[PDB]
Amino acid sequence: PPRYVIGYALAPKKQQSFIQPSLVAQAASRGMDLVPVDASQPLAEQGPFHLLIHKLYGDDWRAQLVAFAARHPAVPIVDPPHAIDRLHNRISMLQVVSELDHQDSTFGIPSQVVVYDAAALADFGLLAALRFPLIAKPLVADGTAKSHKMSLVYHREGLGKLRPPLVLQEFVNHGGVIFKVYVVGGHVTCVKRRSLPAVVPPAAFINQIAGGLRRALGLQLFNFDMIRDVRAGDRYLVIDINYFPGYAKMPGYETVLTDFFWEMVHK
Amino acid sequence: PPRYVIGYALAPKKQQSFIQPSLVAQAASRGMDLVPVDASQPLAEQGPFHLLIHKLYGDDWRAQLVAFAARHPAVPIVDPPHAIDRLHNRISMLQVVSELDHQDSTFGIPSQVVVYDAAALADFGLLAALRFPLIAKPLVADGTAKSHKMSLVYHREGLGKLRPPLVLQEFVNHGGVIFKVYVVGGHVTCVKRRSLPAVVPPAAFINQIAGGLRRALGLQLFNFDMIRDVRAGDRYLVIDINYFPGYAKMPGYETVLTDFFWEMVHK
Ligand SMILES: [Cl-]
Ligand SMILES: [Cl-]
Numbered sequence A, B: 001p002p003r004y005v006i007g008y009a010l011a012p013k014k015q016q017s018f019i020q021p022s023l024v025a026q027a028a029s030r031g032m033d034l035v036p037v038d039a040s041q042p043l044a045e046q047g048p049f050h051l052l053i054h055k056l057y058g059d060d061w062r063a064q065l066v067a068f069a070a071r072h073p074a075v076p077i078v079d080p081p082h083a084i085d086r087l088h089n090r091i092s093m094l095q096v097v098s099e100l101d102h103q104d105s106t107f108g109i110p111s112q113v114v115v116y117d118a119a120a121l122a123d124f125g126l127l128a129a130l131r132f133p134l135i136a137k138p139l140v141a142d143g144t145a146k147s148h149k150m151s152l153v154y155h156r157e158g159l160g161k162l163r164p165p166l167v168l169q170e171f172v173n174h175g176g177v178i179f180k181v182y183v184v185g186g187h188v189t190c191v192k193r194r195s196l197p198a199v200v201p202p203a204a205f206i207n208q209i210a211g212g213l214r215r216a217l218g219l220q221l222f223n224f225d226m227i228r229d230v231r232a233g234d235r236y237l238v239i240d241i242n243y244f245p246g247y248a249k250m251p252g253y254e255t256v257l258t259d260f261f262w263e264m265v266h267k
Helices: A012-018 A021-028 A059-071 A081-087 A090-098 A118-123 A125-129 A203-217 A253-265 B012-018 B021-028 B059-071 B081-087 B090-098 B118-123 B125-129 B203-217 B253-265
Strands: A004-009 A032-036 A051-054 A106-108 A112-115 A134-138 A151-153 A166-170 A179-184 A187-191 A221-229 A235-243 B004-009 B032-036 B051-054 B106-108 B112-115 B134-138 B151-153 B166-170 B179-184 B187-191 B221-229 B235-243
Touching: A004 A253, A021 A032, A021 A253, A032 A253, A051 A059, A051 A253, A059 A081, A081 A090, A081 A203, A081 A235, A090 A112, A090 A203, A090 A235, A090 B090, A106 B118, A112 A125, A118 B106, A125 B125, A179 A203, A179 A253, A187 A203, A187 A253, A203 A221, A203 A235, B004 B253, B021 B032, B021 B253, B032 B253, B051 B059, B051 B253, B059 B081, B081 B090, B081 B203, B081 B235, B090 B112, B090 B203, B090 B235, B112 B125, B179 B203, B179 B253, B187 B203, B187 B253, B203 B221, B203 B235
Parallel strands: A004 A032, A004 A051, A106 A235, B004 B032, B004 B051, B106 B235
Antiparallel strands: A112 A166, A112 B112, A134 A151, A134 A166, A179 A187, A179 A221, A221 A235, B112 B166, B134 B151, B134 B166, B179 B187, B179 B221, B221 B235
């Protein structure tokens, strides 16, 4: 019958990991043509698309997506740059998680300390009452930098050498395990990574959170970090959310994505 | 010669305090007609304006200002709603203050604790090492609510009864004085309010900060709260910023505003 064009605008490293022959071939076998977006030409002069997927940042790419969205309201963008932006301030991101509605399993948000300058990082009294280890992230980051990754701190001296502005979370109530939950539209997958280089949370609970994050963030492609609060044992916290992660690591990612692409071009 | 129309879109209480006969008459004496915007009609069908000043919130008023700004790019809006929004998240607001560049007087940003839910407000260990009193604000607020005001907390029991999500700042290093600095474009005024119901900071320093906030926030009308860190005695912190404050309280506000309106319609 008819064919659907899936335009992709990805950095070369993300093309190499995500746009694999096995994905291109599975999708073509179902009538879907994955077509790269030329970065050296405007998207406006670039050919019919039934779906645009991207992981590019900055005001020129944003402007192109803003114009594309005006010219072609019915063509889904995954994901809209105003929705990716909701992840860029750690404090406003966790604010979005705090808006979700709430069985046997409970859902929390971990308190944060924000330190804006070097003087505060030396002299703020409260920092001497922190339990270690800490999770530290820059307050604002898009993920593109290596220094935008959540990093562990083991003592006051290590904290003292970080670059403010930063957000600090205590990291002691979780029994040294982290659950990375991969989401693709209505579909969840879950990876029992072990932090500080086990029993998974209930699947129905994870699906409720995954779906609430999708509706609240307006993102189809993301992965959320979750911990068990092992004081109580049936309490869980979301500690991070990341746009369009390394799906290529999960075996069977090609089938999950192809199913998602097919769903999106029949919305 | 020609006359200039200054449209104003204000709540009735703000009309009563700010749009006083003495302001209307001074401005008319200089060729400037202050004209109220009809809230029951679209702004698009509302008459030539050489300047629009407002203090209204919400998506309908925003949409009207977005359309006005497209149709009439050369007519200044004071202030643009995307710029007022920069004040609505306390953490991203202080992030904007942290971006300013930096003599005898130094300039800091106070560390904050963010508490997202009721469980954290009871159980977060770090809160038992806070010094009191604290400044507490909701993480997100526009100022229109009575509960959106920065409030003082004197002990753990009082902290325990607040409504998260909230931002906590220790409030002990300032020797019980707060400086409210009123800004109108390039012009500063300064009020030695005494907190917890004196020597002012140097005027050149205040003007540098006022001007950096104006460029960074893109606001003409605001007031910033500043404290002296009395450990060192030549260090100052910005602890709050508010859109379009009670200028009518300062004597001589009519002359300051009329001069600002005249400057804006000759940009
Ligand atoms: Cl990938
Ligand atoms: Cl007023």
